[PDB]
Design a protein around this ligand. Sequence first.
Ligand code: IO9
Ligand code: MN
Length: 428
Amino acid sequence: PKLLNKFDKTIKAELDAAEKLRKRGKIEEAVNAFKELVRKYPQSPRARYGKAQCEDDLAEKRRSNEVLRGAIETYQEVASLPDVPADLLKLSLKRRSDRQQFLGHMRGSLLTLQRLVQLFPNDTSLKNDLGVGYLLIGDNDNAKKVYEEVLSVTPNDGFAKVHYGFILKAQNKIAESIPYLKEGIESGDPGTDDGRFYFHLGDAMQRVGNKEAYKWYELGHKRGHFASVWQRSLYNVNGLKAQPWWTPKETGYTELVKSLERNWKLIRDEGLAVMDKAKGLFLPEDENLREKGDWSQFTLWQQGRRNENACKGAPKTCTLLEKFPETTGCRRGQIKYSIMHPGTHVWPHTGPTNCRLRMHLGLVIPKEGCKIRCANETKTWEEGKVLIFDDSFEHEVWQDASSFRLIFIVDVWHPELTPQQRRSLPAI
Ligand SMILES: O=C(O)C(=O)C[C@@H](O)C(=O)O
Ligand SMILES: [Mn+2]
């Protein structure tokens, strides 16, 4: 790569030093060197480019945005000087865009990418990156137009294909998204071996009733994107017993389970009263997971935080749960009532973390028609009885009964997490 043009080429003899004072790892040296060559040879592009790469690394070191924000401008400075090597120009603005994205300046990074495409209107790689810039600001229509131009010129570019598929899927063109994601992934091209595209390919296939989704999930597993073909959560802790269904005894949380089973009519009655008196406290569940039907939830604890207005409506239930911080303190979980009406189907999905187990207490369960699957096992609820599964494993639900189904959902920390783990895990 030709980063040295005439104007600089003369004074390369000293350039090598500064860059190796970096490679050496003596960043302090490298910075001051390049800064000194900045004043000795203002005009030099490589001189600038060096000061910026120094600042970039000195920021990773100190972990200082303020620092990195300095580099982002110096990368811009490389691109103001004259007869700047196009290799070096591409390099510097590519890095600025990346660093802009790192800090959250998505539109700023888009502007940089827009500039690079104007400078280099035949670099496909840069158009691909521009489309990401558009995605990162939510402008999928302009991202769609970019990947269409690329595909018009390079019809087998896997990076554009998988991104085109994503955009199609997000425009509710689900069946059309699938071959784009399949072919992009199978191209093996750089940037296509990303767990997000396996996730979307399998979701799309499931949603059009294509059993081949699990092949791709298994391939995702083999490629490191998923714990297994069934357990596909994103935010995981290693070393936690992984099984879809659990018994109370297996969890150790036997006193919690007893308190829920033994006081279940109280728990029921408070929820039914909120249904009757404050029905708008039950909020509609995830529209994305809802194929059809009527499905709503009344949350008492969100990520370790008590909802106080909720507990004024379910006072005795909240008071009961206070005794069990394995759930009230589960920052990766929830505690919520959940009502599902006839004609409801919940798409197969997993939750976000393997750090919780999900308990379901049955409160109002019609005698036929309600069922939940987790992995290969399909079960049903019972009034006053708790079911426990690991919702990081794919689960799916159906409500084909003649009246409403009410359950009570209680997340607990995975029982193998140690107290210090429970204490230090970020919430989600
Ligand atoms: O508990 C979950 O994680 C579910 O996906 C289903 C649940 O919300 C329900 O009402 O049946
Ligand atoms: Mn779920």
